[PDB]
Amino acid sequence: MKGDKKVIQHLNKILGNELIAINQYFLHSRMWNDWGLKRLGAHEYHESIDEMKHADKLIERILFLEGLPNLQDLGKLLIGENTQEMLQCDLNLELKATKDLREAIVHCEQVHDYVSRDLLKDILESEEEHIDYLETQLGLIQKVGLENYLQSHMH
Amino acid sequence: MKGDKKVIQHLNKILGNELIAINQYFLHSRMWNDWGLKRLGAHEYHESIDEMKHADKLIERILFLEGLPNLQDLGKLLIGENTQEMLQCDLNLELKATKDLREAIVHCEQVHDYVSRDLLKDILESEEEHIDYLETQLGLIQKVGLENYLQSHMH
Amino acid sequence: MKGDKKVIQHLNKILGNELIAINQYFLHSRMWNDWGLKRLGAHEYHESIDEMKHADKLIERILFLEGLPNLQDLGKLLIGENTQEMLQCDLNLELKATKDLREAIVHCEQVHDYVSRDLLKDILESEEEHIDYLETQLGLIQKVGLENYLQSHMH
Amino acid sequence: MKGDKKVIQHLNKILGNELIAINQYFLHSRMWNDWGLKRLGAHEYHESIDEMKHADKLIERILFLEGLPNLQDLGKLLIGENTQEMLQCDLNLELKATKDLREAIVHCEQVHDYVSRDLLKDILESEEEHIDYLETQLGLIQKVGLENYLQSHMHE
Amino acid sequence: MKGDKKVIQHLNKILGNELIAINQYFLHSRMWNDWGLKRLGAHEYHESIDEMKHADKLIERILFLEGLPNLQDLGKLLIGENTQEMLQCDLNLELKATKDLREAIVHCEQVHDYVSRDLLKDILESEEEHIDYLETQLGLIQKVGLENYLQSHMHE
Amino acid sequence: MKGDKKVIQHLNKILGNELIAINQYFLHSRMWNDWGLKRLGAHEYHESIDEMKHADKLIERILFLEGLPNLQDLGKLLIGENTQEMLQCDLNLELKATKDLREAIVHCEQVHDYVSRDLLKDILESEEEHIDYLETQLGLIQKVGLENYLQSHMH
Amino acid sequence: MKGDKKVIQHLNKILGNELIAINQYFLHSRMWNDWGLKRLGAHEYHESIDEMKHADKLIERILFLEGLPNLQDLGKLLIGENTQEMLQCDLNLELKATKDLREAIVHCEQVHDYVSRDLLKDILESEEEHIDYLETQLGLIQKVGLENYLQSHMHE
Ligand SMILES: O=C1NC(=O)c2c(NCc3cccc(O)c3)cccc21
Ligand SMILES: [K+]
Ligand SMILES: [K+]
């Protein structure tokens, strides 16, 4: 079904953000596992898988709309060197992702692509839940101390 | 069955205290959840539900006694800004609640409303168990230290 | 995540409406139970619980957006003195609630808070279902007569 | 297998009646549900589904006989505005439906289309059962009073 | 709860489209079954049932909004006479249906009927999924050839 | 119970038709199996068994009516030499069979043998279902092509 | 445990090949699904997941050896426009992948990193199974014809 060209551009931009996040979260996950922080590693793995699910839906929507999904261009991964930096890198990425999602929703609404808007709203809800998680973890580090925070994520 | 007017007044006073506690505990619960202190959030949620159960029994008793349950007047919520303060606000509210319960029981006994006395005694038992819990949490903050106390209430 | 100040104001207004409804429906429920109209009492209890669930989600959203949920200011309960009046009082409350929900949604859309919009839309769907129920009951009182209507809600 | 042209016309006429009944009963059902008369709404929903089943068999038969099932021409829905009227509208429709079924059976017998006759007889049995239900409901309104009758149909 | 008059008109227009689709898909289904293409017949039957579900929700919404659901006016059925034509007729109908859904959503948003908007959005998602299916089937006829495509739809 | 002589003659004629069909379908079934077209062989076997069931009921009815069932006179089998011819031969046989069934029913109705009429009507319904199947298969040969049609009946 | 720097370079090169394959196979899967060729889509999805598992093991090994896994540099995806081209693009990628795996194993053996060699051997066994599958599919297109090949991959 022939889609709006600018909608497809917006969907590919969001897909590009999700592809960064997949790799960034997967690497952070395996770094935490290598350090013995297996609870952080598992949670970050599941964040990576969630982003994959969003990417899948975007790819499927772009193909339905007769566009070409762009899996070739990969933007800059924000990789931290320690736990606090890795969480902050994830948060910085998510805040850019939600800005782009809002701009895409505006355009979908203007051209009456209400199904694409709904898909993007569902993705936005997931990303705001991730922001909540990340803000909460950074706050916990300040409240319980870094050593305790890391201890709680060993097992 | 026509109840004693001053009994009904006392029952409405206790109901008023329970309505404050329902809202105070519910908000404290959701603050703790928002901060990632989910064990505190869950326990405080169940404290809110317990107060709802007491309020239900008071409302039923007042209606049986042909009085009007007052759910309109909401007194001052004591909301803390950190875990230590939230627990102490709950304790301050519970100590006022038990004072009012004792005065209500005195009057029930004087006018031979032994069933209302028994209901208030059961509520007083629950409130003293809550005081025990709160005093114990504040003691644990001292004995294990704040960072450990908060850490223990993350999961 | 810092929310829009007016969005948070609107969410607190909707929360205030839900807090009125919780208490109004809970009292109406216990009045109906006291009168032996147990089917009305049970259904109205479940309406109270449904409003509690909405209030919970609003409180959680407000806190995530770094606002202060207002559980202190309780507006006017609309309490009836007989079944038709109680049903009409619930309906009057719901009609005010849905007007406020629509105004809140308009503002969320304007400032691109699409997740808050979605939460409010879900609440609005529940409130219109409650309006449907209430209008239906008032219609049934006319169709089957008040005595039969009450009879059908004894058990 | 090429059927008799007039048999196919009769089958399409009965199909036409069933298509009216499907919509009329479905709308009546949802009206009753909207008023809180859920027992009437559920029963009328099942009457709509039963008509759908008859329509299905007529469509299948017409196609087997190499005719064209007519789902385009929808006749007049008899929509009532209160319970007694809605039941009476259903009854009025069914009485027309059974007259048409009888005339179609006559013609099937004359041209020896005994399988089409048997299908129409089965549908006629269902429609007479519906007439029994409807006459009974109208009678009950008279016997128990309208308010009680509606009361008894609030809950499933 | 009295709805906006133009919202109710839009809802009745979408209902009208769904009523066409119910009959068109049901007839196509039984045509395919009669030809021995039972997999197409079953899938098209389920498309007819899906449209019935949407019609039901629109009828319920219109009644809640104190309007009159229009089940009397049935527009033009697009009946094909071979598999490719039947799929194309379904697609042509769906494309008209989604245009009307979009215009109705616009108006619901303007008058703040956000619940009606959400219902129409859900229906639009289902109809775009149907367009996906239909475009895919037409594409497969081109890729695998018509004879193979039909062969693959003989058996369930 | 003494039956009408012409009714019994008609029932024996229909029985004769069924006996032809039993053998014709059984042979066609085993030809298709020998050629590796097992789905056609199985379906045609079940057509043979269905005709056996009809023959059984006719024999039982004839005997009840105190006639002599004729299993001796076997009419001409219509055996094809390839799949399309075999299907067409079955259809030609079925078209003769249904003509004879209609004539038999006319006579049963005239002499008020309504039970024999009902048995013949049931047999006629089965035979028209078989006609539907056969016409459909011949149509499928045209729609999917002979090679594909045969391929679909291998397994 | 400090690994050999050239081993880590080789592991990152193989990881880079796996990252290309994950995306190429995922896109090819979703293209085949969009075309209704669901059996090809499903199989290609599972090929993508298999490459993800290999990438995970490589990342884990690189981190254990105190290297930095490179998930940033993504080489050229080879995307086909039709089924035959997509299969050949996958095959071309796999042949490059196995050449790089063999060179990595040579170097692991030279510096006595026998555990890294064993990991790469396991990945190579999987990649040669993928090559077997791809060569077989291309051969089946020649043996049964493209239309039949595609037909056989419509349904899972
Ligand atoms: O909080 C409240 N508890 C009540 O009972 C109440 C009200 N009662 C109205 C009423 C009066 C007399 C008999 C009745 O059956 C009901 C009105 C506003 C607020 C409240
Ligand atoms: K009664
Ligand atoms: K083939």
Short mmCIF file of N, CA, C and O in Angstrom, two decimals, chain B residues 57-155:
data_model
loop_
_atom_site.label_atom_id
_atom_site.label_comp_id
_atom_site.label_asym_id
_atom_site.label_seq_id
_atom_site.Cartn_x
_atom_site.Cartn_y
_atom_site.Cartn_z
N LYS B 57 -15.40 -1.45 57.49
CA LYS B 57 -16.14 -1.94 58.65
C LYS B 57 -16.75 -0.78 59.42
O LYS B 57 -17.87 -0.91 59.94
N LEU B 58 -16.04 0.35 59.51
CA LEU B 58 -16.60 1.51 60.19
C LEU B 58 -17.82 2.05 59.46
O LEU B 58 -18.83 2.38 60.09
N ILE B 59 -17.73 2.16 58.13
CA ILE B 59 -18.84 2.66 57.34
C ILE B 59 -20.06 1.76 57.51
O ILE B 59 -21.18 2.24 57.72
N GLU B 60 -19.85 0.44 57.45
CA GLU B 60 -20.96 -0.50 57.63
C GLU B 60 -21.59 -0.35 59.01
O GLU B 60 -22.83 -0.34 59.14
N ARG B 61 -20.77 -0.20 60.04
CA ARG B 61 -21.28 -0.08 61.40
C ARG B 61 -22.06 1.21 61.58
O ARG B 61 -23.13 1.21 62.19
N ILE B 62 -21.55 2.31 61.02
CA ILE B 62 -22.25 3.59 61.15
C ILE B 62 -23.61 3.52 60.48
O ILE B 62 -24.62 3.95 61.05
N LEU B 63 -23.67 2.93 59.28
CA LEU B 63 -24.94 2.81 58.58
C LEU B 63 -25.91 1.92 59.35
O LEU B 63 -27.11 2.22 59.42
N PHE B 64 -25.42 0.82 59.94
CA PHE B 64 -26.31 -0.03 60.73
C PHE B 64 -26.90 0.75 61.89
O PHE B 64 -28.08 0.58 62.23
N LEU B 65 -26.11 1.63 62.49
CA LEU B 65 -26.54 2.43 63.63
C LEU B 65 -27.31 3.68 63.21
O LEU B 65 -27.60 4.53 64.06
N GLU B 66 -27.65 3.78 61.92
CA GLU B 66 -28.51 4.84 61.39
C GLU B 66 -27.85 6.21 61.47
O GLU B 66 -28.52 7.25 61.59
N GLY B 67 -26.52 6.22 61.37
CA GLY B 67 -25.76 7.44 61.20
C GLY B 67 -25.32 7.62 59.75
O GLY B 67 -25.54 6.77 58.89
N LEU B 68 -24.69 8.76 59.50
CA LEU B 68 -24.20 9.09 58.16
C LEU B 68 -22.68 9.01 58.16
O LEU B 68 -22.02 9.82 58.83
N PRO B 69 -22.06 8.08 57.43
CA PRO B 69 -20.59 8.02 57.39
C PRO B 69 -20.04 9.24 56.67
O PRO B 69 -20.46 9.56 55.56
N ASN B 70 -19.07 9.91 57.30
CA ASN B 70 -18.45 11.10 56.72
C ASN B 70 -17.22 10.69 55.91
O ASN B 70 -16.16 10.42 56.47
N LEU B 71 -17.36 10.66 54.58
CA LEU B 71 -16.22 10.47 53.69
C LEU B 71 -15.83 11.75 52.98
O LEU B 71 -15.01 11.72 52.05
N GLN B 72 -16.38 12.89 53.41
CA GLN B 72 -16.17 14.16 52.74
C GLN B 72 -15.00 14.93 53.35
O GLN B 72 -14.25 15.59 52.63
N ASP B 73 -14.86 14.85 54.66
CA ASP B 73 -13.87 15.64 55.37
C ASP B 73 -12.59 14.83 55.41
O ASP B 73 -12.56 13.70 55.92
N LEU B 74 -11.57 15.34 54.75
CA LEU B 74 -10.26 14.72 54.71
C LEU B 74 -9.28 15.63 55.43
O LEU B 74 -9.06 16.77 55.01
N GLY B 75 -8.72 15.12 56.52
CA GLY B 75 -7.72 15.84 57.29
C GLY B 75 -6.35 15.84 56.62
O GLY B 75 -6.18 15.44 55.47
N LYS B 76 -5.35 16.31 57.37
CA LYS B 76 -4.06 16.63 56.78
C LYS B 76 -3.23 15.37 56.54
O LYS B 76 -2.94 14.62 57.48
N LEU B 77 -2.82 15.17 55.30
CA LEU B 77 -1.89 14.11 54.96
C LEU B 77 -0.49 14.52 55.41
O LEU B 77 -0.08 15.66 55.20
N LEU B 78 0.22 13.59 56.04
CA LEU B 78 1.59 13.82 56.49
C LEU B 78 2.51 13.11 55.49
O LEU B 78 2.71 11.90 55.57
N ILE B 79 3.03 13.85 54.52
CA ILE B 79 3.78 13.26 53.43
C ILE B 79 5.26 13.56 53.65
O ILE B 79 5.65 14.73 53.78
N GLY B 80 6.07 12.53 53.68
CA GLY B 80 7.50 12.74 53.83
C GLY B 80 8.18 13.05 52.50
O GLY B 80 7.62 12.85 51.42
N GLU B 81 9.44 13.52 52.58
CA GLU B 81 10.24 13.76 51.38
C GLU B 81 11.37 12.75 51.19
O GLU B 81 12.08 12.81 50.18
N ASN B 82 11.56 11.82 52.13
CA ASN B 82 12.50 10.72 51.97
C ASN B 82 11.99 9.58 52.84
O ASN B 82 11.04 9.73 53.60
N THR B 83 12.62 8.41 52.70
CA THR B 83 12.15 7.21 53.39
C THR B 83 12.03 7.42 54.90
O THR B 83 11.03 7.05 55.52
N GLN B 84 13.07 8.01 55.51
CA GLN B 84 13.07 8.23 56.96
C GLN B 84 11.86 9.04 57.39
O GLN B 84 11.18 8.71 58.38
N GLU B 85 11.60 10.13 56.67
CA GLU B 85 10.48 11.01 56.99
C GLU B 85 9.14 10.34 56.72
O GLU B 85 8.18 10.54 57.47
N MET B 86 9.05 9.59 55.62
CA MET B 86 7.78 8.94 55.32
C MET B 86 7.39 7.95 56.41
O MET B 86 6.22 7.87 56.80
N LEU B 87 8.36 7.15 56.88
CA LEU B 87 8.07 6.23 57.98
C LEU B 87 7.66 6.97 59.23
O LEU B 87 6.71 6.59 59.90
N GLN B 88 8.39 8.06 59.57
CA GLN B 88 8.01 8.80 60.77
C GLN B 88 6.66 9.49 60.62
O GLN B 88 5.91 9.58 61.61
N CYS B 89 6.32 9.96 59.42
CA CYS B 89 4.99 10.53 59.21
C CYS B 89 3.91 9.47 59.43
O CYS B 89 2.86 9.74 60.02
N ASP B 90 4.15 8.25 58.93
CA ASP B 90 3.20 7.18 59.18
C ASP B 90 3.07 6.92 60.67
O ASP B 90 1.97 6.72 61.19
N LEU B 91 4.19 6.92 61.39
CA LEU B 91 4.12 6.64 62.82
C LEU B 91 3.40 7.76 63.57
O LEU B 91 2.60 7.50 64.47
N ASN B 92 3.68 9.01 63.21
CA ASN B 92 2.99 10.13 63.84
C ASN B 92 1.49 10.01 63.66
O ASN B 92 0.72 10.23 64.61
N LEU B 93 1.05 9.62 62.45
CA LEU B 93 -0.37 9.47 62.19
C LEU B 93 -0.96 8.31 63.00
O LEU B 93 -2.07 8.44 63.55
N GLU B 94 -0.22 7.19 63.10
CA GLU B 94 -0.71 6.02 63.85
C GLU B 94 -0.83 6.32 65.34
O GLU B 94 -1.73 5.80 66.00
N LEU B 95 0.09 7.11 65.89
CA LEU B 95 -0.01 7.45 67.31
C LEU B 95 -1.23 8.32 67.61
O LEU B 95 -1.88 8.16 68.65
N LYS B 96 -1.56 9.25 66.71
CA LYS B 96 -2.83 9.97 66.85
C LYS B 96 -4.03 9.03 66.70
O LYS B 96 -5.04 9.16 67.41
N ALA B 97 -3.96 8.10 65.75
CA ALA B 97 -5.06 7.17 65.53
C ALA B 97 -5.35 6.34 66.78
O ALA B 97 -6.52 6.12 67.13
N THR B 98 -4.31 5.85 67.45
CA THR B 98 -4.55 4.99 68.61
C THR B 98 -5.08 5.79 69.79
O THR B 98 -5.92 5.31 70.55
N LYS B 99 -4.65 7.05 69.94
CA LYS B 99 -5.24 7.89 70.97
C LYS B 99 -6.75 8.04 70.75
O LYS B 99 -7.55 7.91 71.69
N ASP B 100 -7.16 8.31 69.51
CA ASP B 100 -8.58 8.47 69.24
C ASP B 100 -9.33 7.15 69.44
O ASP B 100 -10.48 7.14 69.91
N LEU B 101 -8.70 6.02 69.10
CA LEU B 101 -9.37 4.73 69.28
C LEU B 101 -9.63 4.45 70.75
O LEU B 101 -10.70 3.93 71.12
N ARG B 102 -8.65 4.74 71.62
CA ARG B 102 -8.84 4.52 73.04
C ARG B 102 -9.97 5.37 73.59
O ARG B 102 -10.78 4.89 74.39
N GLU B 103 -10.04 6.64 73.20
CA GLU B 103 -11.14 7.47 73.67
C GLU B 103 -12.48 6.96 73.17
O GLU B 103 -13.48 7.00 73.90
N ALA B 104 -12.53 6.46 71.94
CA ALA B 104 -13.79 5.91 71.43
C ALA B 104 -14.21 4.66 72.20
O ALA B 104 -15.39 4.50 72.51
N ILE B 105 -13.26 3.77 72.52
CA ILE B 105 -13.58 2.57 73.28
C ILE B 105 -14.14 2.92 74.66
O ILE B 105 -15.11 2.31 75.12
N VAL B 106 -13.52 3.89 75.34
CA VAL B 106 -14.04 4.36 76.63
C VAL B 106 -15.51 4.70 76.52
O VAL B 106 -16.32 4.32 77.37
N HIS B 107 -15.88 5.45 75.49
CA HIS B 107 -17.26 5.87 75.41
C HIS B 107 -18.18 4.71 75.06
O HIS B 107 -19.28 4.59 75.63
N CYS B 108 -17.76 3.84 74.13
CA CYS B 108 -18.56 2.66 73.81
C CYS B 108 -18.86 1.84 75.05
O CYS B 108 -20.00 1.37 75.25
N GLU B 109 -17.85 1.65 75.91
CA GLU B 109 -18.05 0.89 77.14
C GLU B 109 -19.08 1.57 78.03
O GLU B 109 -19.93 0.90 78.63
N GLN B 110 -19.01 2.91 78.13
CA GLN B 110 -19.88 3.64 79.04
C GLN B 110 -21.35 3.51 78.64
O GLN B 110 -22.23 3.44 79.51
N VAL B 111 -21.64 3.49 77.33
CA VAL B 111 -23.02 3.40 76.87
C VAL B 111 -23.40 1.98 76.48
O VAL B 111 -24.46 1.77 75.89
N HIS B 112 -22.57 0.99 76.82
CA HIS B 112 -22.88 -0.44 76.65
C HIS B 112 -22.95 -0.85 75.18
O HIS B 112 -23.62 -1.85 74.85
N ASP B 113 -22.26 -0.13 74.28
CA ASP B 113 -22.17 -0.52 72.86
C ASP B 113 -20.97 -1.45 72.71
O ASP B 113 -19.90 -1.08 72.21
N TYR B 114 -21.17 -2.69 73.17
CA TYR B 114 -20.07 -3.63 73.26
C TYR B 114 -19.63 -4.14 71.89
O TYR B 114 -18.45 -4.49 71.71
N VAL B 115 -20.53 -4.17 70.90
CA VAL B 115 -20.14 -4.58 69.55
C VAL B 115 -19.27 -3.52 68.89
O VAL B 115 -18.26 -3.83 68.24
N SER B 116 -19.64 -2.24 69.03
CA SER B 116 -18.77 -1.20 68.51
C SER B 116 -17.42 -1.23 69.21
O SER B 116 -16.37 -1.06 68.56
N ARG B 117 -17.40 -1.43 70.54
CA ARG B 117 -16.12 -1.56 71.24
C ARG B 117 -15.25 -2.65 70.63
O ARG B 117 -14.05 -2.47 70.40
N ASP B 118 -15.84 -3.82 70.38
CA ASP B 118 -15.08 -4.94 69.82
C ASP B 118 -14.51 -4.62 68.45
O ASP B 118 -13.37 -4.99 68.13
N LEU B 119 -15.28 -3.94 67.59
CA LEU B 119 -14.76 -3.51 66.30
C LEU B 119 -13.58 -2.57 66.48
O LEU B 119 -12.55 -2.72 65.82
N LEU B 120 -13.70 -1.60 67.38
CA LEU B 120 -12.61 -0.66 67.58
C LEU B 120 -11.39 -1.35 68.19
O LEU B 120 -10.25 -1.01 67.87
N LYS B 121 -11.61 -2.31 69.08
CA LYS B 121 -10.49 -3.06 69.64
C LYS B 121 -9.73 -3.81 68.55
O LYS B 121 -8.49 -3.84 68.56
N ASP B 122 -10.45 -4.44 67.62
CA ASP B 122 -9.78 -5.13 66.53
C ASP B 122 -8.96 -4.16 65.68
O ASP B 122 -7.83 -4.46 65.29
N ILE B 123 -9.53 -2.99 65.39
CA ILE B 123 -8.79 -1.98 64.63
C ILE B 123 -7.57 -1.52 65.41
O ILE B 123 -6.47 -1.39 64.85
N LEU B 124 -7.72 -1.30 66.72
CA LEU B 124 -6.58 -0.88 67.55
C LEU B 124 -5.47 -1.92 67.54
O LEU B 124 -4.28 -1.57 67.48
N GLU B 125 -5.83 -3.22 67.55
CA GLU B 125 -4.82 -4.27 67.44
C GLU B 125 -4.05 -4.17 66.13
O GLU B 125 -2.81 -4.27 66.11
N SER B 126 -4.76 -3.92 65.03
CA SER B 126 -4.09 -3.74 63.74
C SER B 126 -3.19 -2.51 63.74
O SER B 126 -2.08 -2.54 63.20
N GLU B 127 -3.67 -1.42 64.32
CA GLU B 127 -2.86 -0.20 64.34
C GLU B 127 -1.63 -0.37 65.21
O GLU B 127 -0.56 0.14 64.85
N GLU B 128 -1.72 -1.08 66.33
CA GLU B 128 -0.51 -1.32 67.13
C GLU B 128 0.47 -2.26 66.42
O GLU B 128 1.70 -2.09 66.54
N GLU B 129 -0.02 -3.23 65.65
CA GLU B 129 0.89 -3.99 64.80
C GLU B 129 1.57 -3.09 63.76
O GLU B 129 2.75 -3.28 63.44
N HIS B 130 0.85 -2.09 63.25
CA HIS B 130 1.48 -1.17 62.31
C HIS B 130 2.54 -0.32 63.02
O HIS B 130 3.63 -0.11 62.47
N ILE B 131 2.24 0.15 64.23
CA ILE B 131 3.23 0.89 65.01
C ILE B 131 4.47 0.03 65.24
O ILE B 131 5.61 0.49 65.08
N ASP B 132 4.28 -1.24 65.59
CA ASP B 132 5.41 -2.15 65.74
C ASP B 132 6.24 -2.19 64.47
O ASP B 132 7.47 -2.06 64.51
N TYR B 133 5.59 -2.38 63.31
CA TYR B 133 6.32 -2.42 62.05
C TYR B 133 7.11 -1.14 61.84
O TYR B 133 8.29 -1.17 61.47
N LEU B 134 6.48 0.01 62.08
CA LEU B 134 7.14 1.28 61.78
C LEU B 134 8.31 1.53 62.72
O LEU B 134 9.39 1.95 62.28
N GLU B 135 8.10 1.33 64.02
CA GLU B 135 9.19 1.46 64.98
C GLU B 135 10.34 0.53 64.62
O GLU B 135 11.52 0.89 64.76
N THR B 136 10.02 -0.67 64.18
CA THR B 136 11.05 -1.62 63.79
C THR B 136 11.81 -1.14 62.55
O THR B 136 13.03 -1.31 62.48
N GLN B 137 11.12 -0.57 61.56
CA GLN B 137 11.82 -0.09 60.37
C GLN B 137 12.77 1.04 60.72
O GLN B 137 13.90 1.10 60.23
N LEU B 138 12.31 1.97 61.56
CA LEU B 138 13.18 3.06 61.98
C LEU B 138 14.38 2.53 62.77
O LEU B 138 15.50 3.04 62.62
N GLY B 139 14.17 1.51 63.61
CA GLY B 139 15.28 0.89 64.31
C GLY B 139 16.25 0.21 63.37
O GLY B 139 17.45 0.24 63.59
N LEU B 140 15.73 -0.44 62.32
CA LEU B 140 16.61 -1.10 61.35
C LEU B 140 17.44 -0.09 60.58
O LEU B 140 18.60 -0.36 60.26
N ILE B 141 16.87 1.07 60.26
CA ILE B 141 17.67 2.11 59.61
C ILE B 141 18.89 2.45 60.47
O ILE B 141 19.99 2.66 59.95
N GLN B 142 18.70 2.50 61.79
CA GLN B 142 19.83 2.71 62.70
C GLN B 142 20.80 1.53 62.69
O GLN B 142 22.02 1.72 62.64
N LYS B 143 20.27 0.30 62.78
CA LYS B 143 21.12 -0.86 63.04
C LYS B 143 21.88 -1.34 61.79
O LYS B 143 23.02 -1.81 61.91
N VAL B 144 21.26 -1.28 60.60
CA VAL B 144 21.97 -1.70 59.39
C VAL B 144 22.49 -0.52 58.57
O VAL B 144 23.30 -0.73 57.65
N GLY B 145 22.12 0.71 58.93
CA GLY B 145 22.49 1.93 58.22
C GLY B 145 21.55 2.20 57.06
O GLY B 145 20.92 1.30 56.52
N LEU B 146 21.45 3.46 56.67
CA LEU B 146 20.41 3.83 55.71
C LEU B 146 20.66 3.18 54.35
O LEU B 146 19.71 2.68 53.72
N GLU B 147 21.90 3.20 53.87
CA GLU B 147 22.20 2.65 52.55
C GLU B 147 21.82 1.17 52.48
O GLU B 147 21.21 0.72 51.49
N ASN B 148 22.21 0.39 53.48
CA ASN B 148 21.80 -1.01 53.52
C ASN B 148 20.29 -1.16 53.65
O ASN B 148 19.69 -2.03 53.00
N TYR B 149 19.65 -0.35 54.50
CA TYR B 149 18.21 -0.46 54.66
C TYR B 149 17.52 -0.26 53.31
O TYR B 149 16.61 -1.02 52.94
N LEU B 150 17.92 0.77 52.57
CA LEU B 150 17.30 1.03 51.28
C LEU B 150 17.62 -0.09 50.30
O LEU B 150 16.73 -0.56 49.57
N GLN B 151 18.86 -0.55 50.31
CA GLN B 151 19.26 -1.65 49.43
C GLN B 151 18.37 -2.87 49.63
O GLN B 151 17.92 -3.49 48.64
N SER B 152 18.09 -3.21 50.88
CA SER B 152 17.26 -4.37 51.22
C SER B 152 15.82 -4.22 50.76
O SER B 152 15.09 -5.21 50.75
N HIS B 153 15.40 -3.01 50.37
CA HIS B 153 14.02 -2.80 49.95
C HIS B 153 13.91 -2.47 48.46
O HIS B 153 12.85 -2.05 48.00
N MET B 154 14.96 -2.75 47.70
CA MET B 154 14.92 -2.57 46.25
C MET B 154 14.12 -3.69 45.60
O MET B 154 13.24 -3.42 44.77
N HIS B 155 14.40 -4.93 45.97
CA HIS B 155 13.81 -6.09 45.28
C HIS B 155 12.64 -6.67 46.08
O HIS B 155 12.74 -6.86 47.30
#
